[PDB]
């Protein structure tokens, strides 16, 4: 179940978030914790391409080896709040599972600055969703969450101590593949 109307950052700077670079997930929280694993790697690239907001996603489960990439076109609901489609692709942008109506995610940027961000997403696949997922992002894959993002977590009524870190997984990313997916 999706249960949160996540509030977008006051003064959100869309060009700085959507600048073509990679964001690494450093910490995450699902409000339905059993919906996602406790060991995981994820990253995204976000940018504008051909006049549209795009994200490219990467997921990796270091226990099961499940690996997948997605390309997403984002439509604007309001500043910092988007509805994204997705197509599953290989790392080269070739399609594995096509866009399908009813497969989509909402995406809200709750906080962002030059190095860090806090986002909410609720993923829908037909009549099923993956619950409310929060992620702390950083421009540096290893970086510890700083004071400002932690203030944003607390101002959303969340407890940062409940987030799961991705650090123990020693994740590695294919940054060229991920960024290049923005034009796919
Ligand atoms: C960082 C922003 C994230 C976005 C925008 C996001 C979005 C998505 C999307 C679009 C899918 C479906 C992909 C497809 O079928 O083609 C998906 C699947 C999944 N996501 Fe995320 N995700 C994000 C982060 C995470 C994080 C941090 C976790 C933590 C475990 C996670 C766990 C999963 C799992 C387990 C699946 C597989 C669901 C299934 O196979 O039914 N993702 N995610």
**Can you give the residue range of the structural domain that contains 50?**
1-184
User: Is the distance from CB of 139 to CB of 117 less than 8 angstroms?
Assistant: no
- Pocket of ligand 1, beta carbon within 6 A: 25, 28, 36-37, 40, 42, 44, 57, 59, 68, 70, 86, 88, 97, 105, 107, 121, 123, 130, 133, 135
Record the tokens describing residue 41, joined without a space: 């790697």
User: By CB neighbour count within 10 A (0-12 exposed, 13-18 middle, 19+ buried), where does 111 fall?
Assistant: buried
Q: CATH number of the domain at 101, please.
A: 2.40.128.20
Q: What is the resolution of this structure in A?
A: 1.1
Total domain count, the chain: 1
User: By CB neighbour count within 10 A (0-12 exposed, 13-18 middle, 19+ buried), where does 22 fall?
Assistant: buried
């Amino acid at each position: 179940a999706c249960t949160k109307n996540a509030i977008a950052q006051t003064g959100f700077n869309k060009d700085k978030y959507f600048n073509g670079d990679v964001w690494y997930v450093t910490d995450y929280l699902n409000l339905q914790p059993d919906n996602v694993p406790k060991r995981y790697c994820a990253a995204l690239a976000a940018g504008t391409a051909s006049g549209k907001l795009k994200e490219a996603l990467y997921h990796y489960d270091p226990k099961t080896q499940d690996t997948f990439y997605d390309v997403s076109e984002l439509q604007v609901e309001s500043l910092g709040k988007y509805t994204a489609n997705f197509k599953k692709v290989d790392k080269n942008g070739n399609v594995k599972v096509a866009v399908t109506a009813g497969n989509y995610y909402t995406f809200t940027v709750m906080y962002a600055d030059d190095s860090s961000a806090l986002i909410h997403t609720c993923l829908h696949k037909g009549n099923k969703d993956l619950g409310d997922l929060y992620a702390v992002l950083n421009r540096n894959k290893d970086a510890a969450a700083g004071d400002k993002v932690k203030s944003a977590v607390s101002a959303a009524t969340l407890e940062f101590s409940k987030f799961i870190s991705t650090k123990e997984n020693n994740c590695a990313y294919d940054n060229d593949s991920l960024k290049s997916l923005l034009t796919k």
